[PDB]
Design a protein around this ligand. Structure first.
Ligand code: OGA
Ligand code: MG
Ligand code: NI
Ligand code: ZN
Length: 331
């Protein structure tokens, strides 16, 4: 078995190897990359996502989210308070202000220390889940707006034709902006490209150990756990690396820098934070190996997690028994 310790692998494809997305994903998994739940892909030195980022300030962040934390430094929830719309220009200016900017620090490790020590005492503002793309339409390789769609994958593998579309989302982050512990909708893959700015640190639990994370989360967030059998789908819970180590949860960590891709694999729980002003683009995707994960994925039926138009059809076809009660939570 490849990668038995489930370490995060880092790939350096050639421009030749970067031409066929599906085949490179299949390659990574032949080397055991999926066992970690997360891989990094450094694009060939000749590749670019677009020529410059000079004109992005006019993107609108229609609903910035102020991420308000409750709990203790290593175990907290966050609630997203909706703020007034602002442009990316305005946001970047806000991220760079004295109140919100990245503090002085020695290196990534010192900054990680400061994040976990001090996160709860500040409420950074996140521009998340904005439909759109920053890839140039002439970028042909690893263009997150030109991937084959999950609906087409399900059609090719399973023969069923469904409604729905699959498009990317932009995330504008600042220091301390946080993504809580989650897997993807329907335990899909994700791919994330860091277009510009400061890094993003990731924590990940190997898919084969995901249930151990869930068991800890039920113990750490006991009221949430009673309210919904899949409350991690709410994307509100944070657990520090220190806490994970204390409870023997297997995990890994890695820092993504501008110009790099990350791929999360089915049922790879991940969480993380932003080091400073940045912009990432991400999208979900599927492969043939995903299908069984999609069949077994948990669902939020309490009605908090409230998920896309396209997810309906995945639940309808892959989880027909759930379909009934799940759409009660989604209606
Ligand atoms: O970048 C972020 O804020 C969150 N991204 C993801 O969870 C992902 O790409 O799967
Ligand atoms: Mg613009
Ligand atoms: Ni994710
Ligand atoms: Zn729920």
């Amino acid at each position: 078995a490849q990668n038995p310790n489930c370490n995060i692998m880092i790939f350096h494809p050639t421009k030749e190897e970067f031409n066929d997305f599906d085949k490179y994903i299949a390659y990574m998994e032949s080397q055991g990359a999926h066992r970690a739940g997360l891989a990094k892909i450094i694009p060939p030195k000749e590749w670019k996502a677009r020529e410059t980022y000079d004109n992005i300030s006019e993107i609108l962040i229609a609903t910035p989210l102020q991420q308000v934390a409750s709990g203790r430094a290593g175990v907290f929830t966050q609630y997203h308070k909706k703020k007034k719309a602002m442009t990316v220009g305005e946001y970047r200016h806000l991220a760079n202000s004295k109140k919100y900017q990245t503090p002085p620090h020695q290196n990534f490790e010192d900054l990680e220390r400061k994040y976990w020590k001090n996160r709860i005492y500040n409420s950074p503002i996140y521009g998340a889940d904005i439909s759109g793309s920053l890839f140039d339409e002439n970028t042909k390789q690893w263009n997150l707006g030109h991937l084959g769609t999950i609906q087409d994958l399900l059609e090719k593998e399973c023969g069923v034709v469904i409604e729905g579309v699959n498009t990317p989302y932009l995330y504008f982050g600042m220091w301390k902006t946080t993504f809580a512990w989650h897997t993807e909708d329907m335990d899909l893959y994700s791919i994330n490209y860091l277009h510009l700015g400061e890094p993003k640190t990731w924590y990940v639990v190997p898919p084969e150990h995901g249930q151990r994370l869930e068991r800890l989360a039920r113990e750490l967030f006991p009221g949430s756990s009673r309210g919904c059998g899949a409350f991690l789908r709410h994307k509100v819970a944070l657990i520090s690396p220190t806490v994970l180590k204390e409870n023997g949860i297997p995990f890994n960590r890695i820092t993504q820098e501008a110009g790099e891709f990350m791929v999360t694999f089915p049922y790879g729980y991940h969480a993380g934070f932003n080091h400073g002003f940045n912009c990432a683009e991400a999208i979900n995707f599927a492969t043939p190996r995903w299908i069984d994960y999609g069949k077994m994925a948990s669902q939020c039926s309490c009605g908090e997690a409230r998920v896309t138009f396209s997810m309906d059809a995945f639940v309808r076809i892959l989880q027909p028994e759930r379909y009934d009660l799940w759409k009660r939570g989604q209606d």
